[PDB]
Amino acid sequence: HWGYGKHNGPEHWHKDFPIAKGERQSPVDIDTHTAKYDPSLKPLSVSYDQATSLRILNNGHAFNVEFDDSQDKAVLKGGPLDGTYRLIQFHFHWGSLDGQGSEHTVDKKKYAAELHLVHWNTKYGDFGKAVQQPDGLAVLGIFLKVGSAKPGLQKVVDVLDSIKTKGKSADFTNFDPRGLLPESLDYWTYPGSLTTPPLLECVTWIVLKEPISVSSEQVLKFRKLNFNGEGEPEELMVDNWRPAQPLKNRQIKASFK
Numbered sequence: 001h002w003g004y005g006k007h008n009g010p011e012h013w014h015k016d017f018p019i020a021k022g023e024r025q026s027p028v029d030i031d032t033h034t035a036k037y038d039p040s041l042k043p044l045s046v047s048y049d050q051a052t053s054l055r056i057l058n059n060g061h062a063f064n065v066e067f068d069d070s071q072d073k074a075v076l077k078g079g080p081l082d083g084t085y086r087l088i089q090f091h092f093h094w095g096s097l098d099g100q101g102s103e104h105t106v107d108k109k110k111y112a113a114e115l116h117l118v119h120w121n122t123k124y125g126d127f128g129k130a131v132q133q134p135d136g137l138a139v140l141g142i143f144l145k146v147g148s149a150k151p152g153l154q155k156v157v158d159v160l161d162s163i164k165t166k167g168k169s170a171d172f173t174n175f176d177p178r179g180l181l182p183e184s185l186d187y188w189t190y191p192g193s194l195t196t197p198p199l200l201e202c203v204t205w206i207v208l209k210e211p212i213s214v215s216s217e218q219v220l221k222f223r224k225l226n227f228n229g230e231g232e233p234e235e236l237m238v239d240n241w242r243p244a245q246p247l248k249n250r251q252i253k254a255s256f257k
Ligand SMILES: CCCCNCC(=O)Nc1ccc(S(N)(=O)=O)cc1
Pocket: 064, 066, 067, 088, 089, 116, 118, 139, 193, 194, 195, 196, 197, 198
């Protein structure tokens, strides 16, 4: 029964998920002056040309665009990663206001939203096994700021009416996630966790430096979604972000000078 409200939100999660107070929790604030350039970091390899999207689902916490991950079709390699990570889903976190919504922050700055492209390490065979491993997942995080529309996001925005409430899904085939990327693949990286329960410490975070711009109308449509199921009292799906957690014994590395 965890959520983002006053009585079940991030401050409560530790009671059911004690790892909430663990040693490599996410998100974190990215202090740009303290992050260190690592010249040995390889360029990211984002190979999404064969991506096969299947479905979009309102799961009561966010909406997920799901992919066929039963073959190497859309994969993330390189950067800090060893091996091949398959794209399984992407989703967003966003705010009730344009000045909040991202999970990671940059010099304490909050963006309007944050995109998470979730990948799992193929050496572990399936996603469920991968989340039990310290190098099981790689999540590519991309900040959203409000300005010009993102044309590649509009197909997502268009379908949200059909998945307004928790448990609703819709076909969502032939979507190209490459349309959600910024120009640059410069990034920060650090070892972290899932940012929602079960908060498993299985994620290599790769956070892009360059935000994408989305329009006020696009993010407004995110905010019309519901946390609740159909026929239940309406609770707008907004502010579904976890705040920055203590960095503890971690260094954030930068791919760029
Ligand atoms: C088919 C889709 C199943 C996905 N299953 C993933 C899942 O159960 N939970 C989950 C929680 C948080 C993140 S985050 N916010 O760190 O990226 C990503 C995934």
